[PDB]
Design a protein around this ligand. Sequence first.
Ligand code: ATP
Ligand code: ADP
Ligand code: MG
Ligand code: MG
Lengths: 72, 281, 70, 140, 52, 121, 177, 208, 104, 52
Amino acid sequence: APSGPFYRVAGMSYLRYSNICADLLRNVLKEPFKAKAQARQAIHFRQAPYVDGKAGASKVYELENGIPKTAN
Amino acid sequence: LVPIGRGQRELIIGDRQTGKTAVAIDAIIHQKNCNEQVPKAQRVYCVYVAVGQKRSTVAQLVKLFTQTGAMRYTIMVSATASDAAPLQFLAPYSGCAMAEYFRDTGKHGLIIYDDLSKQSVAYRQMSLLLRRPPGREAFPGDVFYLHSRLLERAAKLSKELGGGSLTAFPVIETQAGDVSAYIATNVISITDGQIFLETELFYKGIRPALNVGLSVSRVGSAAQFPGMKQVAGTLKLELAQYREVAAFAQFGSDLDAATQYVLERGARLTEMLKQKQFAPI
Amino acid sequence: PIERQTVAVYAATKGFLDKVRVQDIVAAEEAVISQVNPAVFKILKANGKITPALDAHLKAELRKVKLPGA
Amino acid sequence: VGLSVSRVGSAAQFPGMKQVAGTLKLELAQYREVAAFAQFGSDLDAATQYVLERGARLTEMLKQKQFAPIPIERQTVAVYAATKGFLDKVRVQDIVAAEEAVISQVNPAVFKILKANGKITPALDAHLKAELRKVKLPGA
Amino acid sequence: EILVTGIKVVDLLAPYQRGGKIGLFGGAGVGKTVLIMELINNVAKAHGGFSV
Amino acid sequence: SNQAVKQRIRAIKNIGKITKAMKMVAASKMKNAQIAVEQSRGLVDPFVRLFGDFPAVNSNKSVVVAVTSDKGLCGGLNSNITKYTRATLATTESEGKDVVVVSIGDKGRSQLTRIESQRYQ
Amino acid sequence: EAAAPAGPKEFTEVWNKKAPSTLIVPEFPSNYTAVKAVGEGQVHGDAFPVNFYTPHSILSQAQKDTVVLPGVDGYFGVKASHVPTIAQLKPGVVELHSGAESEKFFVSGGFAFVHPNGVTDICVLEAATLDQVDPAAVKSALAAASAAQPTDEFEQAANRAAIELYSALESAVEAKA
Amino acid sequence: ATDLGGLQERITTTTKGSITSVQAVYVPADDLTDPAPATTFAHLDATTVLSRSIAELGIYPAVDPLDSTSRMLNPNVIGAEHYNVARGVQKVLQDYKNLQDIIAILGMDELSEEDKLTVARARKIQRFLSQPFQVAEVFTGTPGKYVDLADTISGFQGVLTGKYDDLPEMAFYMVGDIKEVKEKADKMAKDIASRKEADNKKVSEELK
Amino acid sequence: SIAELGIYPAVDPLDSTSRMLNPNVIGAEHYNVARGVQKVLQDYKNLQDIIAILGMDELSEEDKLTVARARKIQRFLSQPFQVAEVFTGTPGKYVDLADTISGF
Amino acid sequence: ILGMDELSEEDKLTVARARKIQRFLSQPFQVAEVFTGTPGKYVDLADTISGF
Ligand SMILES: Nc1ncnc2c1ncn2[C@@H]1O[C@H](COP(=O)(O)OP(=O)(O)OP(=O)(O)O)[C@@H](O)[C@H]1O
Ligand SMILES: Nc1ncnc2c1ncn2[C@@H]1O[C@H](COP(=O)(O)OP(=O)(O)O)[C@@H](O)[C@H]1O
Ligand SMILES: [Mg+2]
Ligand SMILES: [Mg+2]
């Protein structure tokens, strides 16, 4: 179906591919620096689509190791 | 919420122009509504004691009880404002003596002492001119005994003495909600229940303005209608939930759908309890 | 005196004391009272009313004032 | 402490207690401000949290049980252990046990020279700095 | 029966009775003589009977 | 009576320190966050230097994101950009475009559904 | 071809005919930038401005004379008046030289723009300098990478992005002074 | 109480005549729990309680709408819509009074949408209850307004249902009826559109 | 105010004292449990001024625990009375001292 | 809440001026020189007017 680089034909956006590479760089840092780089990795929010203006189902995120490498 | 039994003392306490006389007049009119449907020994003969009011108010009430039909069960004792302070001091005791005929002979009475505070004012006048030394708020020392010996005659007599009853509805007017006054705490310590009527709920459309939190009844559900007992307990607990959830309702942006549930249910029950006057259900 | 008060209020309410810094009006109104010809004080005190000649001459003499700072 | 005064006590107390009670009264004064301020501990500064932790340490230090009065030389070393360091590791719930650990664990030879000399001489200050380190605090 | 006064707050929220006792409460310059002058000016001229 | 104002003094005297504690908490949070804002401000420059800045485009589908707060003691922040959103949703829409409204923050989902109930998604 | 010449100035009038006048016009992100792309200048000879950027930190706003960027075609070097490029950077080392001195930030990937006014904007996500990477946890990461055989194309591309960073990070610590 | 009662009971309407009694009642130190005002309260059919807090807001006559009562406020006497609009005005004003402390502390920008709607409608009906008096025009200069009862009932029913949310708050200040608030809003939105060139002076150099 | 929450018997726990609350006479465990109940209820009283404005989202789960513990304790101090069976439809409960010590 | 270095330059001038005024309102006392040692000095009126 798609066409382009290896992330665009895998159904991955460029933001997720670059965040995956940034997380893999953060994982191999020195311990004075990887502990500080643990702080910029945590994802904590929640989204809920509003199809009517009053309600909607919810999906939360409590991730600590970074962006999900598996497709969502 | 605050059910009243045949024989107890239920104080109607509130401020000025809040619905104390209206609650009492609904209590009188409902007795004529029920007296046409019950046998001889179940009828209630009201006695309305009007101390310190105008003759216009008593004339307006006699016209209202004539147009309802309730005069044929009601006595109207009325020592108004132009009368002497001994007469306003003695009008509650004369009205209770008139209602003790129905108590002592197996019938049921409903004695309503409108403005027991005005009796206290007239008794204070009559005592200060007799040179008796004043006390707190210039009232005499025995102003507790004054209302105590009056309100203890509302009794449910035994089966040996005819089984008749007398239900007192004393009416105390407070000043700006201050129930910590002398006469107010006296009659609050005497009577069983309290029908406390607030001015701030009176102008919120809650009429009769019964403060559900402070209104109690020490007979309680021992003398309630069953069926009303089955649903009124749920009503009491849900209105308690609606009372405690409040002072957080200024922020309608913050939905919860668990406290908003009890908020909407309590507001349903709040608007349920409102009632147009002079038409008892 | 009352004529030097209403001349001060006429200088401040009719916009003539516009553009003056607010810590300078306590000197600017002394300049209005001192520099303006006293004939308008005498006329305003005599007939007791701002006549249609006097407001015309009064705006004219309120244009010729050296308010401090400008 | 904010309302209780002793208007003779300025140089009418124990000199060894006067060495530490000035700093005790000053660092409790700064706690009586921010104590009602920061009930919460979610978002703090590093400066107000130091004053709040010293003040909570001194508050849970200063209480004592009924019918057990302490001699002045033994409460002086507890206030000395609380206005100095030596106690910033027990949270709040151990300082009652930490003070009893101090009184039971400190060599009782310093109490005699503190009671006799009246104040904490710098040799006794050195041994009190030292002997308060070799106690076994119950903060686990 | 109502007594129309021409005052908005009086006619709306505390309407006066034609033949009833009316009180104007308030202390020390809140306007209970200007209000009674306006009640004279509005009611007494449209009355017909005598005034005291 | 005389203990009504004696307790009201206690209530307002405790609010007068709760709000000052919250003021110092907000001030320390702003001090800690200003250094992150000033570091993050740089990377927005090359994209508006390359791609320009074209707000008044004739888009067919647009997504409007109003970045609001979660907690609501901000004092006129989340309501001001709702004014700017209704002034911006009424600026690009002149030709029949589809608009999605998105909100970040609870005070955005409480306030954009008030004026815009159906295009919010 | 230019059927709607929009802009910050062109948005103002379309706003003011349909916004309330009490609402002042909102500011735009182009107003907070002092250097643009089109206008000629800001190179002056040998030393050209380089703006190294990450989302969480600004790593350089200085002036360099050469910057070595790890583009997806290979490590190229931007001199002063380079051709305008929009160059996607694969995971590699960015070297910024201002003279004889060089600072070597290993980056994670992200674009680099040379502009028609000679400014260079490197835009990466994670850019660690070279001495703060752990040279022993690279092999233990890429062994678990290359030993992980996925089934979905998504996890395959994530593993390919793992190997293409870790093999380049092997070559970034091995023979460096 | 008996002195005041023996006086006030002679002021009644009998079957042979009528006395319409309007009585000013001073309250000492602006206190309504003083025994002379609190005793006078029982003797009156209508009550009009004037507040200092409302006079200092510029509202005149400074009637407290949540403390001035009457016996004629009864739907069996004055009609159903008059009673309904009176009780609606009173409920809006009481709900506004319940929010005064949280408007003071947290500010106006922290309320709900129904809260900052009912506060705005309450501030409109607070100014709309004020009225310039015909006897008070010698120290104010604005002329007086005799409002009909139908005019004020309809004018307050409009503000209660919400026919005038777009009008400013100060358009209701010191106007007669619901036409004059619209005329004042038009006149005060001409004032924010009134700009002249060269100030049409023609004062200097008159002809003789 | 304790009866306004529905908690009956409405004994104010931070106003009721006894001379028998010495540890010398009721032992150490009863004394420590009583003082700990009074301590967490005074803590809830001091936190009630924050959680009645804010609403328990600024306590970082270090005092969010003690508010729920104090709420469980304030509910658990209520008890059905045998003489209050005729008011409310609930049979009375007589609790032994070791059981209430262990429960609190 | 913000810091020493936040404020303006005229604010720094008023801070320095008032911090040196607050010290200049201090004055040693001639009665206190026996348990403090340092002598105290009676200041004339025109001297402090010129100094401030
Ligand atoms: N439940 C109600 N619904 C509507 N109106 C009510 C209700 N109860 C009272 N009122 C009104 O309150 C007004 C005041 O009369 P009320 O019966 O309140 O006098 P009171 O408060 O008992 O005594 P006082 O007049 O001495 O204060 C009456 O006009 C009555 O119509
Ligand atoms: N309707 C009104 N319009 C304007 N001002 C008023 C009005 N009513 C009262 N005032 C102000 O109140 C002042 C005096 O009130 P007054 O009627 O003397 O009250 P009191 O009789 O209680 O002293 C007047 O000077 C006037 O300024
Ligand atoms: Mg009454
Ligand atoms: Mg007067």
